[PDB]
């Protein structure tokens, strides 16, 4: 996608 | 089947017998538990004597009024001093 | 087969149906009979007659003494708290008021009240009513601080260990340090006379506090100390808690090799001693899933959390903080797992179930709620960029902006300005502003997230790599500072390769961004180079992927206690 | 072979051995130093259980042994509400 | 009287229980009425008020079994050149005693030991014979 | 600051004093209330007499066991014809003993 | 400056006048014909309130007067479980 994952919960 | 709560004084012997069975079969099986001959003990349903010739199908109850969870009470009376005493069934206890 | 019912269970049904008049004689029944009557009251749905008996400390103390059937008592208690009656607050207030009347009495009744308070506070901490268990443990502490004696020092240090746990779970970290200092004071007093208390549980709780406060290095130091102070005579609960918190401190310190053994042994101990349907085993599975999610084992990390939720939801009813934490952890792991799929229907379902629960039981100004907001926003924003509508996308961006802003304000109020989680919020806002077509603020958010996560953590950590990847994706796609984007892509790729090897799943987006960057800048030979690099990455991704379930890797352990602990400790040099 | 359950107040409750062995506590009471296989009976003494509840216990013994693996509908055991509690304390003690 | 929780002095009940158990172990005669009354004594100890005395009863039962097995060990060490015969007869007596105590302690096993590190009295006696 | 109950038979004096205050100041308080000279009074704490020179904190009256919400009983006696009667602190009325809910019937 | 709060049993709780005027009812009792007691202390008769309840009321008076408008944390008044019912009716009646 555009960018990476989401940092932490 | 037929389930009975044959009770005399303190003794409250439980019994399983067929509806087609007879009174004398009850007497002959009580022979091996209370060790007395049938001519010495007589059944007493409620307050009336039970004739030995009447089968349990028409003795005064049935298979629905003598359920295993609610057996029918039958009295007894032995012979002492060459005579027969009346039934002496006493109540179990008073619930609180 | 129609097996006839037991006379015990038949009389229990008959007595319960008579509960209108036989309500005073049941309270004088044996403890095993008395609990079964109340469990039958629960099973019949008569919670108002049940809840009018569990609101009393004397009656609840007799049903708390059935240790085997506490897995049913937890579900009954959760049903009562979901019913509407505040049994947890009522019992805590009753104990706190009743202990003061006998605090001036003899030591025997004081010890009996301390035991009752330990049982009740342990129950309320297990259930998750940490704010309603803090009162009980505080009252036990005032019972423990009136007589100068060895056993009262033991009870006081146990009170401070358990009171540290109810203040970590309530996100009261500015009281937890004071509680640990008081515990250290009492422990030093105890060791002054030559009797050394065991400090495994205390140091484990402090490690959990410092990890929750995002002080990863000092949490690692304190978990090292806790592992140093593990003996053979410890209860299984303390050993499991220390192992879990040491594994969590190790995995966030990028020492995945030690954390793996620690958390696998913790899962083995929790499953062996407690069972497959215990709250403690569920907590150990939750920490195991945290490890798996932080070591790039996402596919089985989702399954491990689903195992953790299926235990907590089966034991702790519907609306609990523990079920809420299981939901918010499973929602984030599912979000990470389907980040390349877009199927955020189960993840959003779990994230919204983790907020509809906490808002019921916790105030809006609570820190633990804020994280549950985060997990929703990272999902909702993604649903914005996969939907085929524009107004829906703008509405989802606005909602996620509200969620991240509220969570950031809560983190700033509680933790402070400069730590790891505030910078995580800043990176989340940077990603959001990149998605919200406002990249000027996104650059500032990413830059300040980099500053905070780099001056506090290392320059080669997982989170720093994640944020430099986000910032370079912001640059090379929209802001068009190609040199900075290239250097940050190389930094992120190097850090990911150092940490997780080439099989790291987060390198795919960095490689795609770098390929787009080179197509937009030239050097077609390097474009082909990174294209075959991506091909090799995908080859390594499909290879060694068909792995067994992570709950199978924790088999009957060929390593027991005083072997995993020793292996962890002797490897610190 | 017929065991002789004696209540607190002395009411004998002679019931079949196989029927009484359903309860774990009577099984333990008979098996041990207190077997006494002679006299063709096995008297067991309950110094704490009243008669109005031991009678219901024996009724349940017959009821359960009769309705083992019964393919028909199992009727409810009719525990009277006034003796329901005193039977409950005599249900976990007897493990029946 | 009544099968209810009631306050009871544990010392005299444990004394009568010990006098019964010493005969129950090592296969000595104990009257059947006493054997049946010890079941009610065990129940009353287990459901005693205010604190159920199941833990104290189990602790002193374990202590008494320790004393008895240690005494048997000393007795069989005092024997020589025929230690197998004495050990076998004492083992038969103690196995029968352990089974009969597991029968007698069935309420403690069911409602206290199995409802909690602890082992059943039948298992405790055999494990203590091993230890 | 220490709070007491002087309990001369049926009377009860809820006075306040400091820990640094002496027993003779307490006797002066009772003089100001009961109109009896301090030589006529003899104070008793738990059937133990209090010396005049001893301070209130010396005799065992700290601000932790004689707080206002639970003051400490201090006995007192009056001289009767150049003598001194023993302490006769009559007990308060016994409250209605609420039965324990777990007491079996 | 001192008032003698005579109870129903004859107990004479001599409490300070500022303390006793915490309660509205004692203030009303000491207003009007009730303040005509020239003999130093004003004796207030409490023929309904027992000694064990009036003692706790006087302790509450000296507790509220001392702990009024205090910035420090204030402990709750210790009321025994067996006395709470009787103290509740005396707290209403005295308006304290
Ligand atoms: Zn309700």
PDB file of C-alpha atoms in Angstrom, chain G:
ATOM      1  CA  UNK G   1     -19.646  26.644  78.700  1.00  0.00           C
ATOM      2  CA  UNK G   2     -20.502  23.084  79.740  1.00  0.00           C
ATOM      3  CA  UNK G   3     -23.843  21.276  79.486  1.00  0.00           C
ATOM      4  CA  UNK G   4     -24.826  18.052  81.253  1.00  0.00           C
ATOM      5  CA  UNK G   5     -26.565  15.773  78.736  1.00  0.00           C
ATOM      6  CA  UNK G   6     -28.462  13.494  81.105  1.00  0.00           C
ATOM      7  CA  UNK G   7     -29.406  10.220  79.427  1.00  0.00           C
ATOM      8  CA  UNK G   8     -32.359   7.896  80.030  1.00  0.00           C
ATOM      9  CA  UNK G   9     -30.369   5.669  82.409  1.00  0.00           C
ATOM     10  CA  UNK G  10     -29.131   8.576  84.530  1.00  0.00           C
ATOM     11  CA  UNK G  11     -25.757   8.955  82.823  1.00  0.00           C
ATOM     12  CA  UNK G  12     -24.669  12.602  82.862  1.00  0.00           C
ATOM     13  CA  UNK G  13     -22.434  13.280  79.853  1.00  0.00           C
ATOM     14  CA  UNK G  14     -20.941  16.680  80.649  1.00  0.00           C
ATOM     15  CA  UNK G  15     -20.022  17.990  77.207  1.00  0.00           C
ATOM     16  CA  UNK G  16     -18.833  21.458  76.210  1.00  0.00           C
ATOM     17  CA  UNK G  17     -21.625  23.836  75.231  1.00  0.00           C
ATOM     18  CA  UNK G  18     -20.056  24.639  71.864  1.00  0.00           C
ATOM     19  CA  UNK G  19     -19.932  20.898  71.149  1.00  0.00           C
ATOM     20  CA  UNK G  20     -23.564  20.246  72.080  1.00  0.00           C
ATOM     21  CA  UNK G  21     -24.909  23.126  69.985  1.00  0.00           C
ATOM     22  CA  UNK G  22     -23.809  21.160  66.912  1.00  0.00           C
ATOM     23  CA  UNK G  23     -27.167  19.388  67.082  1.00  0.00           C
ATOM     24  CA  UNK G  24     -30.228  21.480  66.334  1.00  0.00           C
ATOM     25  CA  UNK G  25     -32.434  19.726  68.880  1.00  0.00           C
ATOM     26  CA  UNK G  26     -30.088  20.331  71.815  1.00  0.00           C
ATOM     27  CA  UNK G  27     -29.795  23.946  70.654  1.00  0.00           C
ATOM     28  CA  UNK G  28     -33.596  24.174  70.759  1.00  0.00           C
ATOM     29  CA  UNK G  29     -33.693  22.479  74.172  1.00  0.00           C
ATOM     30  CA  UNK G  30     -31.181  25.038  75.466  1.00  0.00           C
ATOM     31  CA  UNK G  31     -33.297  27.911  74.096  1.00  0.00           C
ATOM     32  CA  UNK G  32     -36.224  29.299  76.050  1.00  0.00           C
ATOM     33  CA  UNK G  33     -37.270  27.805  79.381  1.00  0.00           C
ATOM     34  CA  UNK G  34     -34.515  25.198  78.987  1.00  0.00           C
ATOM     35  CA  UNK G  35     -31.727  27.729  79.594  1.00  0.00           C
ATOM     36  CA  UNK G  36     -33.066  28.797  83.007  1.00  0.00           C
ATOM     37  CA  UNK G  37     -30.743  26.350  84.815  1.00  0.00           C
ATOM     38  CA  UNK G  38     -28.665  28.781  86.874  1.00  0.00           C
ATOM     39  CA  UNK G  39     -26.537  26.041  88.472  1.00  0.00           C
ATOM     40  CA  UNK G  40     -23.551  26.367  86.101  1.00  0.00           C
ATOM     41  CA  UNK G  41     -24.126  23.536  83.632  1.00  0.00           C
ATOM     42  CA  UNK G  42     -27.475  23.259  81.845  1.00  0.00           C
ATOM     43  CA  UNK G  43     -28.855  19.771  82.469  1.00  0.00           C
ATOM     44  CA  UNK G  44     -30.528  18.361  79.342  1.00  0.00           C
ATOM     45  CA  UNK G  45     -32.724  15.328  79.964  1.00  0.00           C
ATOM     46  CA  UNK G  46     -32.858  12.658  77.249  1.00  0.00           C
ATOM     47  CA  UNK G  47     -35.407  10.168  78.614  1.00  0.00           C
ATOM     48  CA  UNK G  48     -35.538   8.331  75.260  1.00  0.00           C
ATOM     49  CA  UNK G  49     -31.851   8.147  74.251  1.00  0.00           C
ATOM     50  CA  UNK G  50     -29.946   5.375  76.081  1.00  0.00           C
ATOM     51  CA  UNK G  51     -26.503   5.839  77.581  1.00  0.00           C
ATOM     52  CA  UNK G  52     -24.637   3.831  74.939  1.00  0.00           C
ATOM     53  CA  UNK G  53     -26.254   5.930  72.194  1.00  0.00           C
ATOM     54  CA  UNK G  54     -25.897   9.317  73.884  1.00  0.00           C
ATOM     55  CA  UNK G  55     -22.236   8.546  74.568  1.00  0.00           C
ATOM     56  CA  UNK G  56     -21.636   7.994  70.861  1.00  0.00           C
ATOM     57  CA  UNK G  57     -23.606  11.167  70.108  1.00  0.00           C
ATOM     58  CA  UNK G  58     -21.358  13.167  72.455  1.00  0.00           C
ATOM     59  CA  UNK G  59     -18.306  11.559  70.861  1.00  0.00           C
ATOM     60  CA  UNK G  60     -19.686  12.679  67.500  1.00  0.00           C
ATOM     61  CA  UNK G  61     -20.064  16.198  68.889  1.00  0.00           C
ATOM     62  CA  UNK G  62     -16.435  16.359  69.999  1.00  0.00           C
ATOM     63  CA  UNK G  63     -15.431  14.735  66.692  1.00  0.00           C
ATOM     64  CA  UNK G  64     -17.276  17.142  64.389  1.00  0.00           C
ATOM     65  CA  UNK G  65     -16.216  20.205  66.381  1.00  0.00           C
ATOM     66  CA  UNK G  66     -12.561  19.154  66.265  1.00  0.00           C
ATOM     67  CA  UNK G  67     -12.630  17.977  62.639  1.00  0.00           C
ATOM     68  CA  UNK G  68     -14.643  20.893  61.244  1.00  0.00           C
ATOM     69  CA  UNK G  69     -13.290  22.801  58.190  1.00  0.00           C
ATOM     70  CA  UNK G  70     -10.006  20.867  58.313  1.00  0.00           C
ATOM     71  CA  UNK G  71      -7.952  20.573  55.127  1.00  0.00           C
ATOM     72  CA  UNK G  72      -6.539  17.215  56.246  1.00  0.00           C
ATOM     73  CA  UNK G  73      -8.206  13.929  55.368  1.00  0.00           C
ATOM     74  CA  UNK G  74     -11.016  13.199  57.820  1.00  0.00           C
ATOM     75  CA  UNK G  75     -11.731   9.659  59.083  1.00  0.00           C
ATOM     76  CA  UNK G  76     -15.332   8.527  59.156  1.00  0.00           C
ATOM     77  CA  UNK G  77     -17.105   8.283  62.486  1.00  0.00           C
ATOM     78  CA  UNK G  78     -16.862   4.707  63.836  1.00  0.00           C
ATOM     79  CA  UNK G  79     -20.380   3.364  64.373  1.00  0.00           C
ATOM     80  CA  UNK G  80     -20.701  -0.222  65.558  1.00  0.00           C
ATOM     81  CA  UNK G  81     -23.025  -2.511  63.564  1.00  0.00           C
ATOM     82  CA  UNK G  82     -25.229  -3.215  66.595  1.00  0.00           C
ATOM     83  CA  UNK G  83     -25.538   0.490  67.481  1.00  0.00           C
ATOM     84  CA  UNK G  84     -26.152   1.949  64.006  1.00  0.00           C
ATOM     85  CA  UNK G  85     -29.909   1.392  64.165  1.00  0.00           C
ATOM     86  CA  UNK G  86     -30.282   3.123  67.537  1.00  0.00           C
ATOM     87  CA  UNK G  87     -27.815   5.873  66.627  1.00  0.00           C
ATOM     88  CA  UNK G  88     -29.732   6.537  63.408  1.00  0.00           C
ATOM     89  CA  UNK G  89     -32.936   7.400  65.263  1.00  0.00           C
ATOM     90  CA  UNK G  90     -30.952   9.576  67.681  1.00  0.00           C
ATOM     91  CA  UNK G  91     -29.197  11.325  64.791  1.00  0.00           C
ATOM     92  CA  UNK G  92     -32.558  12.215  63.242  1.00  0.00           C
ATOM     93  CA  UNK G  93     -34.112  13.261  66.549  1.00  0.00           C
ATOM     94  CA  UNK G  94     -31.134  15.383  67.577  1.00  0.00           C
ATOM     95  CA  UNK G  95     -30.688  16.862  64.064  1.00  0.00           C
ATOM     96  CA  UNK G  96     -26.931  16.324  64.380  1.00  0.00           C
TER      97      UNK G  96
END
